[PDB]
Amino acid sequence: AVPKRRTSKTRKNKRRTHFKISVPGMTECPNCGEYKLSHRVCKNCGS
Amino acid sequence: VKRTYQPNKRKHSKVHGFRKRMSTKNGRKVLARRRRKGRKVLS
């Protein structure tokens, strides 16, 4: 129930391949200038 | 669970008091020993 051998920098960096965030929708607004989330409440309300 | 060392003002000064240490010969040695070391608190 305890690590038999210490993990190296290669194996440790290989396990963190899918560990990341993803860019959101960010729908353009028709009259505001700033961006907004899709299907949200603002000046764009999606597109 | 009932632990040890029950705080008590009276008893504390009636066992480790300065007058109690100056009532015997062995107790006097303790004071002399602590004084030699340079302890701030004698009792």
Binding site: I21, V23, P24 | -
Partner: protein, 112 residues
């Protein structure tokens, strides 16, 4: 030219602030600002304040156009770590690490 802004002693683990720094690396100032206002993290608000300061320095000290800037570099180094303690099962005590971070952003127009 090139303009930069750094934030020292930022109370936030460097491994958590390096996840939001891989979303605005090589993007435009406009896009970057929009991506930081849509990201749901505890570093976005702090990183957004640093990026804003970097743009102001390039429009005042260098008087460059802020409508054609591009995030060149963006990384986070480690800083002084604080040592804390919390009790365990018996009379043992585990150790806690409160690491900090040194966020840095270099904005440029891509011209010598």
């Amino acid at each position: 030219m090139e303009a930069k802004a750094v934030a020292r002693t930022i109370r936030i683990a460097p491994r958590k602030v390096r996840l939001v720094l891989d979303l605005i690396r090589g993007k435009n100032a406009a896009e970057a600002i929009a991506i930081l206002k849509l990201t749901n993290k505890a570093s976005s608000p702090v990183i957004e304040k640093v990026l804003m300061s970097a743009l102001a320095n390039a429009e005042h000290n260098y008087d460059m156009n802020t409508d054609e800037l591009v995030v060149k570099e963006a990384y986070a180094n480690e800083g002084p770590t604080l040592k804390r303690f919390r009790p365990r099962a018996q009379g043992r005590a585990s150790a806690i690490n409160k690491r900090t971070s040194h966020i840095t952003i270099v904005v440029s127009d891509g011209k010598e």
